[PDB]
């Protein structure tokens, strides 16, 4: 896929427990590189990737964390303001806690220029308003969200956001891809094997494992007699290993003796060709 820069903002109100907590994280692809927490004693943008603590920042952009800190504090204040007005739009009491989330950033195209921009919001975990891919128009999910859409159309906020995408967003994504090249411009293929777990006289579990892959996107399936078995099998949600790689497995329950009917199929960007393998 294309490289992506994404920020995720979460704010939660806490009635009778003071101000909303604001949390920010930034990702290049599936690698986190920064954080901000309004509840930290002295909240600032902190690095969350080794390549964001290399000599280059201090040697060439020493105010990098100060700028992000300043922008994050601003966002915290905007989101406090957003939770107040949303309570109004939806006629909800001061007493219940609510959540506002924002995802935004840019996909980098081969032209070294913007491929796609995102700017979208949820309230209490449901679509509220999104910027459409054309980057000039808005999708509002309900009556409340049309209030914001009219507000933002009238102020021309779309045009403002485009300016960020085509400017800072792609420029900084390219800076991160360069300075974190070893980590980010890489595709660790999955290593796959099959394991064998008796269940009963009528069932043996075949579990196909994919380990140590980056990025997270993968295709992992069983065929019986070359017929896809997604419809029968247990497929776990892709999970982090905790070292910057991902894990997955797919299990089928099979009649004992029928093991050689079943083939596991692995597809990942790091693989020269898809993998096919079987129990031992």
């Amino acid at each position: 896929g294309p490289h992506s820069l994404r920020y995720f903002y979460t704010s939660v109100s806490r009635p009778g427990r003071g101000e909303p907590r604001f949390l920010a994280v930034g990702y290049v692809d599936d690698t986190q590189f920064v954080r901000f927490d309004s509840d930290a004693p002295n909240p600032k943008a902190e690095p969350r990737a080794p390549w964001m603590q290399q000599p280059w920042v201090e040697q060439e952009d020493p105010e990098y964390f100060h700028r992000s800190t300043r922008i994050f504090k601003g966002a915290a204040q905007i989101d406090r303001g957003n939770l107040q007005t949303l309570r109004g739009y939806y006629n909800q009491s001061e007493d219940g806690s609510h959540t506002i989330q924002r995802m935004f950033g840019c996909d980098l195209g081969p032209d070294g220029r913007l491929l796609r921009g995102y700017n979208q919001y949820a309230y209490d975990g449901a679509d509220y308003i999104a910027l459409n891919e054309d980057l000039t128009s808005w999708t509002a999910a309900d009556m409340a969200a049309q209030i914001t859409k009219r507000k933002w159309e009238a102020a021309g906020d779309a045009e403002h956001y485009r300016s960020y995408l085509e400017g800072l967003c792609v420029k900084w994504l390219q800076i991160y891809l360069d300075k974190g090249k070893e980590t980010l411009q890489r595709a660790d293929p999955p290593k796959a094997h099959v394991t064998h777990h008796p269940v009963s006289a009528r069932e043996v579990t075949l579990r196909c494992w994919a380990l140590g892959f980056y990025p997270a996107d993968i295709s992992l399936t069983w065929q019986r007699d070359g017929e896809d078995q997604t419809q029968d099998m247990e497929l776990v949600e892709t999970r982090p290993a905790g070292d910057g790689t991902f894990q997955k497995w797919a299990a089928v329950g099979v009649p004992p003796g029928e093991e050689q009917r079943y083939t596991c199929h692995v597809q990942h960007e790091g693989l020269p060709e898809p993998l096919t393998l079987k129990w031992e």
Partner: peptide, 9 residues
Amino acid sequence: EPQSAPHGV
């Protein structure tokens, strides 16, 4: 580098 919305909801 992030951005903040020039306006609230």
